[PDB]
Amino acid sequence: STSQVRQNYHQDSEAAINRQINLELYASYVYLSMSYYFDRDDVALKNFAKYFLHQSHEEREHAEKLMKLQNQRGGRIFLQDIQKPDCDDWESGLNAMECALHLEKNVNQSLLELHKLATDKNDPHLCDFIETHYLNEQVKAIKELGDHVTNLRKMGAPESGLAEYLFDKHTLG
């Protein structure tokens, strides 16, 4: 039953990877929802829509890289339901950016816990995988989202629809 390739790969690490795969797919689905919210005729912020669609695809890529990891190490992927996002209506560009920031920080926290587990199980390959492909990506994403939220707030979002319009044009466009 044990994979011929498996070496120094703890069952707990395998399970945590499966959980991270689900979380990445969940994040992808959240971003998809946000994108198409901004595509609504009564919201109509095309560059917000594009920004979040790109993020959705990137999150899918992250999940697939974790699946590849799982198979490389000889673990077995076990997929779960991808839960629907918390909202259907994201209310504003600013609110969407804040929710994205919160999501990214949650994903980062899960990654940090994964790293802690890898460290505890003396799995340096897994640790460096997380470090190389995930942690800096998260730090960058969080910094970018924080920058966006800051600009929107200073511009006067969400009450200034002009604010969101011009942010859509000049930052996200």
In this structure, the chain runs to a length of 173
CA distance 170 to 173: 6
Q: Pick from 12, 15, 54, 71: which binds a copy of itself (CB under 8 A)?
A: 71
Interface ranges with Na ion (CB under 5 A)? 59, 62
88 burial (CB, 10 Å; 0-12 / 13-18 / 19+) is exposed
The least CB distance from residue 93 to Mg ion, in Å, is 16
**Nearest to a copy of itself of 5, 15 (CB atom):** 5
Structure tokens at 162: 């002009």
The least CB distance from residue 82 to a copy of itself, in Å, is 4
Residues 14-53 that bind a copy of itself (CB under 8 A): 25, 29, 32-33, 36, 39-44, 46, 53
The least CB distance from residue 101 to a copy of itself, in Å, is 7
What residues contact 172, with CB distance under 8 A and at least 6 apart?
47, 48, 50, 51
Q: Which residues are annotated as part of the binding site for Fe cation?
A: 24, 59, 62, 104, 138
